[PDB]
Amino acid sequence: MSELEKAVVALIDVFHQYSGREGDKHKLKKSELKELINNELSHFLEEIKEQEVVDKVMETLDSDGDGECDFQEFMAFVAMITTACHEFFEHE
Amino acid sequence: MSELEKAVVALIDVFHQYSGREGDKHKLKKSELKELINNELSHFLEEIKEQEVVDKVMETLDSDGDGECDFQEFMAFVAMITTACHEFFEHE
Numbered sequence: 001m002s003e004l005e006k007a008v009v010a011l012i013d014v015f016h017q018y019s020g021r022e023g024d025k026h027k028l029k030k031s032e033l034k035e036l037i038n039n040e041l042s043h044f045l046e047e048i049k050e051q052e053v054v055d056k057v058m059e060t061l062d063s064d065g066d067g068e069c070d071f072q073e074f075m076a077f078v079a080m081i082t083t084a085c086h087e088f089f090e091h092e
Numbered sequence: 093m094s095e096l097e098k099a100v101v102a103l104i105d106v107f108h109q110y111s112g113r114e115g116d117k118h119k120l121k122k123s124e125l126k127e128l129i130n131n132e133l134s135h136f137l138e139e140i141k142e143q144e145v146v147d148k149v150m151e152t153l154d155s156d157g158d159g160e161c162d163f164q165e166f167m168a169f170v171a172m173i174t175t176a177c178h179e180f181f182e183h184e
């Protein structure tokens with residue numbers, strides 16, 4: 001597989017690992033999203049240590065308003081992060 | 093870096109490699125997008141061998157209508173592919 005293909009699979013993998021912990025196995029609840037961010041984005045995002053930060057992050061990502069982050073919403077989050085880093089690294 | 097973080101960097105890397113070949117170094121023209129798809133998505137997408145396919149792919153991805161695929165448009169493309177694979181692999 002190419003680096004791009006492996007990246008696609010990694011995105012699916014990490015979402016699977018975290019979404020499947022509790023409740024709906026295909027959505028991230030607050031606790032699952034928090035742990036995904038804290039364990040897997042520790043170099044890109046500040047560690048979440050406050051309930052109010054958990055709440056605001058979910059509120060921002062939950063565009064369909066069901067209180068959880070589904071795969072499409074997770075991809076939008078990944079796009080946000082990647083775009084920020086693209087602009088940072090390319091000086092855009 | 094986590095697998096998720098490495099994936100983010102890979103997306104930026106592959107876009108950088110292809111966008112920087114010709115013209116605007118931060119957008120993919122038709123030839124650059126074609127080669128990105130053919131070289132880097134050879135296991136996910138059928139190889140593009142026809143001008144009309146190149147044209148339709150760019151037409152679909154070029155949501156701002158400037159004739160090229162920028163980073164945001166590339167991320168939307170990655171989201172399309174990853175979502176398709178997520179649904180395939182999770183039986184969603």
Ligand SMILES: *C[C@H]1C(=O)[C@]23[C@H](O)[C@H]1CC[C@H]2[C@@]12CO[C@]3(O)[C@@H](O)[C@@H]1C(C)(C)CC[C@@H]2O
Pocket residue numbers: 043044045084085086088
């Ligand atoms: C690509 C990531 C990165 O290196 C950032 C962010 O996490 C994200 C884009 C913006 C980068 C920062 C903010 O945090 C970073 O981790 C850090 O490397 C960057 C510093 C060095 C703090 C400069 C600001 C920039 O926004």
Ligand SMILES: *C[C@H]1C(=O)[C@]23[C@H](O)[C@H]1CC[C@H]2[C@@]12CO[C@]3(O)[C@@H](O)[C@@H]1C(C)(C)CC[C@@H]2O
Pocket residue numbers: 135136137176177178180
């Ligand atoms: C995750 C990718 C994948 O494995 C696919 C696609 O490229 C994408 C999701 C859908 C998969 C297919 C179509 O092409 C694939 O490469 C292939 O593995 C899948 C087959 C086996 C052809 C079954 C249909 C499915 O849509």
Ligand SMILES: [Ca+2]
Pocket residue numbers: 018019020021022023024025026027028029032
């Ligand atoms: Ca869950």
Ligand SMILES: [Ca+2]
Pocket residue numbers: 061062063064065066067068069070073
């Ligand atoms: Ca939601």
Ligand SMILES: [Ca+2]
Pocket residue numbers: 064070072
């Ligand atoms: Ca939804």
Ligand SMILES: [Ca+2]
Pocket residue numbers: 110111112113114115116117118119120121124
């Ligand atoms: Ca270019």
Ligand SMILES: [Ca+2]
Pocket residue numbers: 153154155156157158159160161162165
């Ligand atoms: Ca465009």
Ligand SMILES: [Ca+2]
Pocket residue numbers: 156162164
């Ligand atoms: Ca644009």
